[PDB]
Paper text:
Cooperative assembly of single-stranded [name] filaments is made possible by [name] monomers switching between a low and a high association affinity state during the [name] filament assembly. In relaxed unassembled [name] monomers from several species, a side cleft between the N-terminal GTP-binding and the C-terminal subdomains is closed, whereas this cleft opens in tense [name] monomers from [name] ([name]) forming crystal filaments, providing a binding site for allosteric modulators of [name] assembly. Binding of small molecules to the cleft between the N-terminal guanosine triphosphate (GTP)-binding and the C-terminal subdomains allosterically impairs the [name] function, eventually inhibiting bacterial division.
To confirm the proposed interaction of the inhibitors identified in our fluorescence screening, as a validation of the ligand-binding assay, we were able to determine the crystal structures of the [name] folded core (residues 12–316)34 in complex with inhibitors 18, 20, and [name] to 1.55–1.70 Å resolution. Omit electron density maps around the compounds clearly prove that the three molecules bind into the interdomain cleft, as PC190723,15,25 TXA6101, and TXA70747 (chemical structures in Chart S1).
Numbering used by the authors: 11 to 315
């Protein structure tokens, strides 16, 4: 079976890895990469890599992305050894600081050279962090795009659209974490489960390899318009820089119980096709889970923008 690894690079990335481990994911390996040895000592990841100790003496990169980049380059063999064997790597990092900005594209490059299908899931900083952080972050996003197979960007300003004046900051961060964690879980499920119309890791590669921007979404619904609703939730994305609009390739899977109808599978597909507003090249899958009663789940991976 295909081996999935999630790598957190820098403070925000390792935060996301810690919160995902807390949440619980059972068939994914986690790797924590950081300059900051204090944060790395608190990581819940089974594999930890301290990079750049000679450069920083165990401190972070101090907002200097060139130090992050050098620290990763100098630890290339340790990063290779930790990746070796993965079929797919997700690299998550917060752009705009020194370690994520500089080291995450090096890690992603190493993963793609090690043979892994490589997906980046990165944040852009809040506008309140100022224009220099935003410009540094943009350069990291560009570098990440050059290094990955596909890239999901989460502008942190979008979190301000989903909170009220009291929502705890940590609850907002968990919402952003969901993008990665549900994208990972959806792939894990595809690999693990045999479908009635069966998709497998080669289909993931076809949809994701060397594609650029991506969307990864899941929607769950019940009741009379469940397929349309689940499809709409899978592609909605209030947190995403890349919406579904313009997608030219899509992997879509529908999971339901024995009641899953052909008609509602077409409805779901049509929602995705119409929201793309393009002629979508679809890879369509279906899973019948007789455990499920009235629940349906639509998973979408969209690329080709
Ligand atoms: N959404 C989210 N953003 C984060 C988190 N931690 C940091 N950030 C963002 O990521 C950017 C860089 O922070 P950090 O990863 O700590 O910097 P680095 O360790 O030096 O690479 C910050 O400017 C914030 O915009 C997090 O837990 N969640
Ligand atoms: C989330 O996508 C998934 C999940 C579980 C599956 F069995 C399949 C499949 N049709 O083989 C799929 F495409
Ligand atoms: K499968």
């Amino acid at each position: 079976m295909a081996t999935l690894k999630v790598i957190g690079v820098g403070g925000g990335g390792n935060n996301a890895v810690n919160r995902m481990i807390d949440h619980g994911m059972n068939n994914v390996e986690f790797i924590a990469i950081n300059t900051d040895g204090q944060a790395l000592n608190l990581s819940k990841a089974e594999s930890k890599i301290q990079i750049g100790e000679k450069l920083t003496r165990g401190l972070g990169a101090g907002a200097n992305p060139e130090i992050g980049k050098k620290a990763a380059e100098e630890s290339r063999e340790q990063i290779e050894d930790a990746i070796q064997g993965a079929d797919m790597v997700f690299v998550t990092s917060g752009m705009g600081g020194g370690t994520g900005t500089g080291a995450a594209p090096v890690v992603a490059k190493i993963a793609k050279e090690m043979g892994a299908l490589t997906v980046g899931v990165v944040t852009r900083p809040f506008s309140f962090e100022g224009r220099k952080r935003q410009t540094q972050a943009a350069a990291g996003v560009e570098a990440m795009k050059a290094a990955v197979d596909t890239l999901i960007v989460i502008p942190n300003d979008r979190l301000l659209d989903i909170v009220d004046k009291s929502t705890p900051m940590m609850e907002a961060f968990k919402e952003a974490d969901n993008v990665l964690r549900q994208g990972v879980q959806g792939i894990s499920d595809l690999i693990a489960v045999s479908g009635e119309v069966n998709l497998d890791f080669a289909d993931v590669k076809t949809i994701m390899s060397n594609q650029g921007s991506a969307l990864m979404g899941i929607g769950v619904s019940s009741g009379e318009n469940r397929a349309v609703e689940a499809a709409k939730k899978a592609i909605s994305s209030p947190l995403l820089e890349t919406s579904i609009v313009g997608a030219q390739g899509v992997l879509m899977n529908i999971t339901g119980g024995e009641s899953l109808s052909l008609f509602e599978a077409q409805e779901a597909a049509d929602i995705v096709q119409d929201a793309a507003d393009e002629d979508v090249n679809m890879i369509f899958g279906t899973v019948i889970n007789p455990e499920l009663q009235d629940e349906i789940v639509v998973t979408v991976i969209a690329t080709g923008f």
